Symmetry: C2
Subunit: 189 residues, 2 copies
């Protein structure tokens, strides 16, 4: 039993990692249960309770969940290649750390668009935690739900192509949640 | 395999200490085990690095000393961040990130008093920063607090007397790391340079 308390921010990355773990169990045929309780007394990050509590963030505690749940997104199920990726994910964390995403959306997209010119995935040649983290950060700009944001997919074709790929890969794990989906629409309201 | 860490003006004490522990762990294996894959990590001084570390694998990545030590502990199995039950391990990993966030973008000199008051209290009831054994949290905070409790800088001699629990814990971590850091010379030299 692990309890994750969230407030204004919903842990999309942690929820997605947990959903992937659940579908891995349903297809492999003791199990660890992670609960996502909404607490009004948390401001912008997540507090995680182990059954003591700690304060973390969605971008960072998802690394812990991948370790625990063996979802094969951050910890691979050679080591030097694994360690190299872990530093690459840290590069993406530092790239958006304490940056206003909306204010710096253009410089962010310019780097991602050029990065995806000859790259299918953000890291290596397979889906990683880096792809999913940036996917939710770019979701409000490239999902096409907000009509005002349709200029980003047309101008940045590589991001739009990559965005469609990650969306399709996550379809079997996130499209049925109806709680992750609910928080996605609220975040774009 | 080969890994090169390029540093500028900041010496990666945490990464150096982790690597030194790994080397002394190898020296205890080969000594008694005689019937039956070593990694070499280089600490190259580059003038064109400002405050972080550049790590090259032999493509390169950009990291920091406080964060890349987690990667080194994973690779070298030094038993400081990844324990070689799992939920308890995960709980510690979040605690180390709390210490990282506690000093993230904070001026250590300006907030030295509130930082020390926070650290002393935890230590009043606890021997180590995390759990009851030496962890990566202890070593990371040890080097951040080193210039204030080592007693080399005469103006900073007030801190050991005012915060005894930190001073107690600092003495312990220094003794535990003595077999791995006191013989380096290269690190000791950078300790003296940093503290002038
Ligand atoms: Tb509580
Ligand atoms: Tb805490
Ligand atoms: Tb594979
Ligand atoms: Tb390679
Ligand atoms: Tb393992
Ligand atoms: Tb006070
Ligand atoms: Tb000894």
């Amino acid at each position: 039993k692990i309890n994750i308390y969230y407030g204004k921010n919903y842990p999309f990355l942690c929820r997605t990692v947990f959903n992937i773990y659940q579908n891995n169990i349903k297809k492999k045929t003791k199990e660890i249960c992670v609960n996502f309780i909404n607490d009004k007394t948390v401001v912008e990050d997540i507090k995680v309770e182990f059954v003591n509590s700690v304060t973390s963030s969605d971008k960072i505690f998802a690394i812990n969940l991948d370790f625990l749940l063996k979802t094969n997104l951050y910890y691979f199920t050679n080591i030097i290649t694994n360690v190299f990726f872990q530093a690459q994910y840290n590069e993406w964390i530092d790239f958006l750390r304490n940056k206003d995403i909306e204010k710096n959306i253009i410089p962010i997209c310019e780097h991602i668009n050029k990065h995806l010119y000859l790259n299918t995935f953000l890291s290596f040649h397979y889906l990683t935690l880096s792809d999913i983290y940036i996917y939710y950060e770019m979701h409000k700009y490239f999902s096409g739900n907000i009509t005002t944001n349709l200029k980003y997919p047309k101008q940045y074709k590589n991001i739009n192509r990559w965005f469609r790929l990650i969306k399709a890969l996550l379809h079997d794990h996130v499209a049925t949640d109806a709680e992750l989906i609910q928080n996605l629409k609220v975040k774009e309201k």
